[PDB]
């Protein structure tokens, strides 16, 4: 049976791409230079530097968004490099859209992959790689929560990266059944028109399932 | 046949570990802060900072050695964090042991995994993750060549990480037959005493082959 092993290998491909992104996100969240920039009071004079730094990562990871959420004097600051623009704002109280932060920082997870609409542009939704810094602020929250906001179209192109015979559909869903993107125990099911074979597997790094259809 | 697929999966495990190391090495070689420290003339005043920075990576990658080779005014400087010590020296001409540099910088490879004896301590030999910076100096050489020096004992523990049935031996060799470490088309060969099954596969990221023996 080539199809099950092929599904496992493609899942491994997705895993290694996300793992490169995750390692870079951890190194960014625990960056000594970013922590020193935070302790210095986040001077605007060095912002350009910071931008360049994040640029060097965006070129390597090919991700649309890069974000840094810093804590200083009890205030949270959200910075984002995207499309050459370096945007900055203040993190909102838990009653607004930034409650995700209060979520991830209240969980004991070192990292989570939460899908959410962008706070600078609510129209676009991204898959955010929230990684927590080892250092904690005086209020108990992570000093830095940095990572990469992935454009879901890329998600579509890297699952469309490999196709079995050039046909079939590959889908990636969430744990509640919310579908994220579209291009072990294998089963056979009759689809509308013609029958197909389906087989699913769950990714722990993404917290999310993966299905695939194949005909002849 | 479970053994071939198991060999492929363990090779994938080795690949993903080395890939985390490689991504961190690339981000370090193309670090904007390191490049600014180089352009500033490599001030000793900031050395502590640099050290801390590299420390933050060594804690994440669990690698014995971290190295940075910088170019400034036509002179090459070799820095290494290891065991809490921040060592620094001048890169030797091609007639000495640093010729590896002139090798890797003369190849069009973005990165190479060269095994070599340490230049600060010739007794210990490491597997060096040489990654080239995108920026080039005025003399045409990479402005920064940074990465991680892996202790081969770790290499032994991550191939001993997974064992089939708790028996058998897994070996990793070079392209000339030089064995690196010890714990597709499968073949059967009679070893001294009792017969065994052997199957090998080549890793492109490591440029190196992988064998494995199994009895019953
Ligand atoms: N909306 C939103 N923006 C983010 N920026 C970083 N992480 C997130 C997240 O989870 N949601
Ligand atoms: N000896 C030695 N030291 C290194 N430091 C970084 N790369 C190397 C290498 O290839 N050889």
Going from the C-alpha of A194 to that of each of A2, A23, A163, A187, B85, the distances in angstroms are 21, 43, 19, 15, 67
This structure was determined by X-ray
Closest residue, chain B, to A9 (C-alpha): B9
A39 and A146 belong to one structural domain: yes
The residues, any chain, with a CB within 8 Å of residue A65's CB and separated by 6 or more, are A80, A81, A82, A118, A126, A128, A148, A149, A150, A151
Quickly count: other Cβ atoms within 10 Å of residue B133's Cβ.
26
**For residue B180, which of B158, B164, B198 has the smallest C-alpha distance?**
B158
- Its domain, for residue B41, covers 11-154
**Atom of ligand 1 at shortest range from CA of A128:** 7
A140 and A192 belong to one structural domain: no
Residue with tokens 């058998």: B168
A26 and A86 belong to one structural domain: yes
B122 and B23 belong to one structural domain: yes
Judge whether A172 and A11 are in contact, CB under 8 Å.
no
Which regions of B52-194 does DSSP assign to beta strands (E)? Answer: 65-72, 75-82, 85-90, 111-117, 125-132, 144-151, 170-173, 179-182, 186-190
Where is the domain boundary, B105, B122, B154?
B154
- CA separation for the pair B143, B137 (Å, rounded): 5
Closest residue, chain A, to B2 (C-alpha): A5
Domain count, chain A: 2
**Residue B193 falls in which region: left (phi positive, over 0), alpha (psi -120 to 50) or beta:** left
**Atom of ligand 2 at shortest range from CA of B115:** 10
Where is the domain boundary, A103, A124, A154?
A154
The residues, any chain, with a CB within 8 Å of residue B11's CB and separated by 6 or more, are B201, B203, B210
Judge whether A145 and A133 are in contact, CB under 8 Å.
yes
- CA separation for the pair A146, A27 (Å, rounded): 9
Ligand 1 contact, A116 CB (< 6 A) = yes
CA-based torsion, B15, B19, B25, B26: positive or negative: positive
Q: Which residues of B touch A33 (CB under 8 A)?
A: 33, 49, 53
Token pair belonging to A129: 């790689």
* In-domain check, residue B63: yes
Query: Ligand 1 centroid to B144 CA: how many Å?
Result: 33
Three-state secondary structure call for residue B22:
helix
- CA separation for the pair A127, A149 (Å, rounded): 6
Q: What CATH number does the domain containing B75 carry?
A: 3.30.450
Any idea what the Cα angle at residue A193 is, between residues A191 and A196, rounded to 5°?
40
Where is the domain boundary, B154, B173, B196?
B154
B96 and B52 belong to one structural domain: yes
**For residue A161, which of A12, A2, A3, A59 has the smallest C-alpha distance?**
A12
B174 and B81 belong to one structural domain: no
Judge whether B212 and B168 are in contact, CB under 8 Å.
yes
A48 and A125 belong to one structural domain: yes
The reply to whether B10 touches chain A by the CB within 8 Å rule is: no
* In-domain check, residue A6: no
Residue A3 is classified by DSSP as H
**Atom of ligand 1 at shortest range from CA of A129:** 7
Q: Which of A77, A78, A87, A100 to mutate to test the pocket of ligand 1 (most atoms within 8 A of CB)?
A: A100
Backbone angles phi, psi at B10, to 5 degrees: -65, -40
Q: Do A53 and B31 touch (CB under 8 A)?
A: yes
Q: Do A27 and B52 touch (CB under 8 A)?
A: no
* In-domain check, residue B2: no
Q: Do A33 and B53 touch (CB under 8 A)?
A: yes
Strand B111-117 with B186-190, pairing:
unpaired
The reply to whether A33 touches chain B by the CB within 8 Å rule is: yes
- CA separation for the pair B43, B51 (Å, rounded): 13
**After which residues does chain A have a break in its backbone, defined as C to next N over 2.5 Å?**
183
**After which residues does chain B have a break in its backbone, defined as C to next N over 2.5 Å?**
183
Question: Alpha-carbon Rg of chain A, whole angstroms?
Answer: 20
A131 and A192 belong to one structural domain: no
Which neighbouring-strand residues pair with A210? A172, A201
Going from the C-alpha of B32 to that of each of A24, A34, B42, the distances in angstroms are 14, 12, 14
The residues, any chain, with a CB within 8 Å of residue A216's CB and separated by 6 or more, are A165, A167
A137 and A57 belong to one structural domain: yes
A169 and A139 belong to one structural domain: no
Three-state secondary structure call for residue A142:
strand
Token pair belonging to B45: 């005043």
* In-domain check, residue A79: yes
Backbone angles phi, psi at A54, to 5 degrees: -60, -35
Token pair belonging to A60: 């390597």
Our measurement of the distance from residue B49's CA atom to the centroid of its chain's CA atoms, rounded to an integer in Å, reads: 24
- CA separation for the pair B62, A215 (Å, rounded): 46
Half-sphere exposure at residue A197, Cβ-oriented, CA atoms within 13 angstroms: 13
* In-domain check, residue B1: no
Quickly count: other Cβ atoms within 10 Å of residue A63's Cβ.
23
Question: Alpha-carbon Rg of chain B, whole angstroms?
Answer: 20
Quickly count: other Cβ atoms within 10 Å of residue B154's Cβ.
15
* In-domain check, residue B90: yes
- CA separation for the pair A126, A154 (Å, rounded): 10
* In-domain check, residue A5: no
* In-domain check, residue B159: no
The reply to whether B52 touches chain A by the CB within 8 Å rule is: yes
Our measurement of the distance from residue B85's CA atom to the centroid of its chain's CA atoms, rounded to an integer in Å, reads: 20
B45 and B142 belong to one structural domain: yes
B32 and B99 belong to one structural domain: yes
Quickly count: other Cβ atoms within 10 Å of residue B36's Cβ.
14
Q: Give kind and range of the element (H or E) at residue A197.
A: strand A195-199
- CA separation for the pair B97, B114 (Å, rounded): 13
Which neighbouring-strand residues pair with A102? none
Q: Which residues of B touch A36 (CB under 8 A)?
A: 49
Judge whether B62 and B28 are in contact, CB under 8 Å.
no
């Amino acid at each position: 049976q080539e199809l099950p092993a092929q599904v496992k290998g493609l899942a491994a491909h997705i895993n290694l791409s996300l793992s490169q992104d995750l390692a870079i996100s951890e190194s960014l969240a625990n960056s000594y230079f970013i922590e020193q920039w935070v302790r210095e009071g986040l001077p605007e004079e060095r912002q350009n530097d910071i931008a360049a730094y994040l640029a060097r990562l965006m070129e390597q990871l090919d991700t649309e968004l890069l974000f840094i959420a810093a804590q200083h004097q009890g205030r949270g600051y959200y910075f984002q490099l995207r499309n050459g623009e370096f945007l900055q704002r203040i993190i909102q109280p838990p009653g607004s859209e930034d409650d995700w932060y209060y979520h991830f920082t209240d969980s004991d997870n070192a990292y989570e992959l939460n899908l959410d609409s962008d706070t600078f542009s609510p129209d676009d939704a991204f898959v955010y790689v929230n990684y927590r810094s080892t250092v904690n602020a005086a209020n108990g929250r992570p000093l830095v929560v940095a990572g990469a906001g992935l454009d879901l179209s890329q998600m579509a192109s890297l699952i469309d990266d490999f196709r079995l015979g050039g046909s079939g559909h590959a889908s990636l869903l969430s744990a509640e059944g919310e579908l994220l993107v579209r291009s072990l125990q294998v089963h056979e099911a009759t689809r509308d028109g013609q029958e197909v074979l389906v087989s699913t597997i769950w990714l722990p790094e993404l917290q999310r399932y993966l299905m695939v259809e194949v005909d002849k």
